[PDB]
Design a protein around this nucleic acid. Structure first.
Length: 46
RNA sequence: ACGAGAACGCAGCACCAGCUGUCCAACCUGAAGAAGA
C-alpha cells in the first residue's frame, strides 16, 4: 500500500546477466571471521 | 755600393675501425552498494 515509486535493480555485468559481485561474499565472510576485534582490519593477514 | 743578392719548410695523408644503453622487477595491498523502525 505504498506504490512502486522506486525500484533498486540487481547488479549485473555488461551483458545484463545478474551476478553476485566481488567483495560481497568477502564481506559476508569478514562479518564472521572478524568475530574477535574491530582493530585488525586492513593489516590483518587473515 | 751592407758575407751580400735571389729562395713559401713546402708537397700527398678522413682521428678513423669494432661495440644493443643493456640485465633483473605483477601498479600491487584491505574494503558487503549498504543500512532507521
Amino acid at each position: 500500500s505504498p506504490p512502486m515509486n522506486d525500484l533498486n535493480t540487481f547488479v549485473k555485468d555488461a551483458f545484463g546477466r545478474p551476478y553476485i559481485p566481488g567483495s560481497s561474499l568477502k564481506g559476508a565472510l569478514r562479518t564472521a571471521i572478524l568475530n574477535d576485534l574491530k582493530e585488525d582490519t586492513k593489516e590483518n593477514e587473515v
